[PDB]
Amino acid sequence: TTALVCDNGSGLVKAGFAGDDAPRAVFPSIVGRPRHQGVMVGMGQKDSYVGDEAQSKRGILTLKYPIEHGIITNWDDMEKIWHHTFYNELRVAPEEHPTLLTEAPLNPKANREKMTQIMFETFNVPAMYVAIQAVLSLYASGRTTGIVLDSGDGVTHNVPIYEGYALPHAIMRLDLAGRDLTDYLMKILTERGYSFVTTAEREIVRDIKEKLCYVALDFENEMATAASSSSLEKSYELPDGQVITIGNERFRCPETLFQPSFIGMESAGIHETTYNSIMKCDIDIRKDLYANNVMSGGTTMYPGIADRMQKEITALAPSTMKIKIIAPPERKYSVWIGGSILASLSTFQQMWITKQEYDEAGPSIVHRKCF
Template sequence: MSSGGNTTTVYGGDEISAIILDPGSYNTRIGYAGDDFPKVTTSSFYGQVGNGKRIFGEDINVPRENCEIKPILKDSIITDWDAAIDQYKYYFEDTLKVDYKDQPVLITEPIWTELPYRQKLIETFYETFDFAGLYLAKAPTCISFQQGRPNCLVVDLGHDTVSVTPVIDGICLIKNSMRTNYGGRFLNDEIKDFVKSRDPKIAVEPTYKIKTKTPTVYPDPAEYTVKKTIPTTTESFNKFQQQRIWHEFKETALEVPERKLNSTNPQQALSIKEFYSQDSQKRLFEFPTGQSITLGLERFQFAESIFDPKIYKFSDENIAKAYPPNNGEIKISSHYNEYRPLKRIRKPESNQSTPAPGEGDDSSEKIRGLSHLITHTLSTIDIDLRASVAHNIIVTGGVSLIPQLIERLYNELSNSNPGLKIRLHAVGNSSERVNQAWIGGSVLASLGTFHQMWVTKHEYNEAGADRILNQRFR
């Protein structure tokens, strides 16, 4: 790959074989630009055995003595740099056989990354891997490219966070964006708290421990036997395996109710709860022990907490402390000017009916659910862009796959914003929806005109980190 200044030559993504790296809090995705899906989708956790060796991928689910399971990222930001480097090197060299000298890398990043983190990320990649070129792309920008919508509102329901980001001409409006921690991990902790506080008769054991089991339904006790030959595992390993149970619970049992469960009218609230407690609404969830529990209203209450995080009250105070009240506002220092729309003369008889910031969106509350986050974000966007953005709301992330979530969100947004034509875009293919940021990066890096966007190590050293980050990686 040439590092010269000749930008007249157009290269396609298949000619340079760029690498796309999409680090997420739950999964990390790696693959080639131009592909439809990543070659590697691996856990963003790793196992560390007693001799210091690190284990990645599905191997971390194999029980071993003295093997600690640790996270690599939190809120999509790398927290364990040594483990991250080892993991990326493992997949770059052993799986993808990357030729660093001839292949550039595009790395997706969340909108809330600070300047020191971005500097460390770039320096680490240049020094450790010596890629031919590098580019940092905001995840919402990649998602907008994947959908082919330069002006949109990206609603990302991830594992650690839920974020709402306006994207205008491919540039993220960070000052108008919002983020909360009421995402997939929040739902997992609700399920864990519910099961553990309900009854000690509910046996929760990881799959690797079970030798035989007999199907039973709670309140009947679980009937199973445990393997005797398994090694003595660590507490972190057992917790990680239990998290997989809560994750499966969330994916298979939850469903968003059509109407709010917390109605201000007591009689209406009672009728709603009675409706969702009917036998036709009940589902069974089977634990690895073979014991099943019947879920009626509870499975709707868990899903309802996406829209109203206050609806579930934690029994375990330690879990409750992990989720302090959050209204979604992001405080981040930005060193560059964001997109500024052309100022137009506004007519005094404007009929926009979206509530102004601080009105009609429960802004007095310290906690904002999904609909309130989106409504508040729309109200802060320039009035000339608001209609275009409201017409292109992209819903993505694994949590968005919960049944009936899109329908409920559309109804609430339409009621909250009567002056706007709301249109939601959610990809029907579940694999595509959870990989949207990676796919967008693949589309972006495979464009022939993107060749001039790569930044080489020589250019980085010559121009300096500040200039590259502020002017090139927007």
């Protein structure tokens, strides 16, 4: 009846209905299991906990993420998350509405084929479609031309779009994402003697990162300042009441996005990746892509990311070029919003894969580009 929109982002499930300006259900993409004992099956105990349950009880659970680098590998856990998304969070049977899913570009074909099989055989979804997140993000901004840099939990990717058309030969993908920034920070923090090694401890570091980190406009000068100025340090209170101090780690973590070599990657930084995607595009397109660099995704939340990227692109770009970073306060939900918008358009209504077409055509249909 109303298209259902579900962004199976790494680390976070965002879902709601088309026409809604926000997801209704927002919870971690986490499935947890008991760590220290078995399940008291003859008593009030469960085999697994999901999303908010997984977080509330995280101190006794081993937590797993079914999605790694944007690819679903743990299909059983992925179904558990969907099972709750549909029946406990949105509380809607799948048989009632068509569903729009999202995906990072350049994944295994199997990832689409398996999501499709599940949505038609485990959940009886009337029709479905799987969209690229960068495209939806641009729909959310309302522009037809620009380059979208979606930097999430598992994948960072750049998809230039011009006058509504994709420029696929220029799509670039990095493995570096929020999951790695968290892991890097866990390692950085051992320098101050704070050792976080368990899964729940990983979740704490993630929370620290989210509240304390920022992007230095000038890393070296910020670091030189940090070396002597105590004004850089901030305290953080841990769940058990202990208090720790975070210093230059507040900006050394996100710096990884500009310098991937910090974690051993040969990868381009986000400002080099963006630049190269633009350079792979036609000379008469480049002007507009520089003019409209569009940010989206949770890692773009670090304060100052917009200014640092403006500086870096400007430095790489021709001196007579106008460079602008577009970074609305709603970047975190850009994909979800784009989903809601697209799902409600009369043009999109013609692109759905119905169950009947799927059953007759088979899995190859998921690679259909109807438009």
